[PDB]
Amino acid sequence: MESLLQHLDRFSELLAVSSTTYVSTWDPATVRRALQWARYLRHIHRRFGRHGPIRTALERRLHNQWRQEGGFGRGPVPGLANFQALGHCDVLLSLRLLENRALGDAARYHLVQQLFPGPGVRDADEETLQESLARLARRRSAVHMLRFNGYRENPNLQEDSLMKTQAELLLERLQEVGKAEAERPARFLSSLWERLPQNNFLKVIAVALLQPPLSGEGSQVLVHWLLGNSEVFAAFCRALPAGLLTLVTSRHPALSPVYLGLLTDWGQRLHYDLQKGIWVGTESQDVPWEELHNRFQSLCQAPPPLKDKVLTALETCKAQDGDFEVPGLSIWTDLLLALR
Amino acid sequence: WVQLGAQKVAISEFSRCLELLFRATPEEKEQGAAFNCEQGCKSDAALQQLRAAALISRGLEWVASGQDTKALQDFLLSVQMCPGNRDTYFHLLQTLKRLDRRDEATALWWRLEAQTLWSLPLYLESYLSWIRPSDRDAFLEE
C-alpha cells in the first residue's frame, strides 16, 4: 500500500513532464525505466484492481492530485484521468513522447523499437504494447468513418450519439467528485462554465439530465446547481429546443415552476401592434411570438402531471391582466386561443 | 356599451371592430356576387376616417379605466392613419400634456401647422361629430 504511493506519484510526475517540451536529457535509460514502471502499474490494475481498500486508496490519491492541480493556470495537464486509465497508462506516455518534437533521436529510436519490434514476437501471453497501438489506430479510423458516412445529427438530442457520450463523461466526473467530497459540485460546475464553450456545455447538460443511473445522484446535483444559478438557466431555456425541455420538465418537477416563470416573464414583455397582426417585442433579444408559441405548445403536449400545471399557470396570468375574450389585448388570450 | 358604462365589453367591441378593419379588405370587387354596395361602403375616405374613429373610441376607454399607456398607443395609431382630422391631435396632445408635455407637444403642433370631409357616409359623420369635444381648437391654440 505505502510502497505504491512513491511509485504512482513518481509516475504521474514523469508522465506530466513527458508532454512538456523540456525533453533534451531523456535517453533509452529514462524510457526503459518509464515503461517498466508502466508495466508494473498495468499489472497492478489487473491483479488487485477491483473491490478492495487499495482501489479506493489509489482513487483518493489520484483525485487529490487532480484537485490540488485543479486544471487552472500553470498547466491543464490531463494526467491519467481515473483508475481505469491505469490499465492503459503506458499507451498514454508513449503517445505523448511521439508528440514531443524535442525528443532526441536515439531515445526516439529505442522507444519505437520497444513499441514496434516487428512480428518477431507475434506469440505473447499478455496483450502487448504493439497490439494495443494497432487496435487504437483501428478504433480511431472506425470512428472517423462512421462520422463521415453513416452518422447523422439526431434532432432528439437525448438519443444522439456524440452528446450521449459527453453526457456520460460529465456524469462520471460528478460521481467521482461526490465520492471524493473534497470540494462541492457547484464549484466544479462553475469552473467548467467559464472555461469551455457555453452553448455546447448547455446542450450537453440537457442530455445528461436524462441519462438513467449507472451505479439518480448525477441529475440530482445538476438540478440544484441550476436552480442556484439563474443566469445560465436564463440562457438554458433560451437556447434548447422545445421537446427537449418538455421531456426535462416532466422528468424533474423541480424544474417546472421556475421555467414557467421564465416563459411567463417573456410574455409580459411583449406588446401588440395593430398594423401587423403579430405580437412583437420592443427589444430584439425578446423571444418572438413564434418561439414562445412553440415552447408552450410543446409543454401542453406532454403527460397530464405537467399539462394541468402549465394550463393553470397560463389561465391565472390571463385573468391577472383583465379577462378579455378577443385578440389584441392579452398575450395570454392569444396563447390560449392558438392552442384550440 | 360605453354610454351604459361597461368598460370591459366596450374595449372588447372596439377591438373587434379594429381587427375587422385591418385583417380584412372591404373593397374586394373581384367577384361580382350580388347587388353589392357600390359607393357608401367602399370609399377609402370612409375606411380611414372609421379606422381613426374606432382607435379614438378605444383610446378613451383605456383612459376611463386608467390604462393611459394603452390609450396612448391607440391615439398614436389614429394619428398615423388620419393626420388631417385634428380630433386625433386633441386627444394625443391632451395625453402628452398630462404625462410628458413639452417636446412632443410642440413637435405635434408643428405637424398640425404642416397639415393646415369629401364624401363620407352619414352614420360615420354623425358618429364623429358626436364623440368630438367642443373645446378642440381652443386647446389646439394652447
Ligand SMILES: [Zn+2]
Ligand atoms: Zn353601403
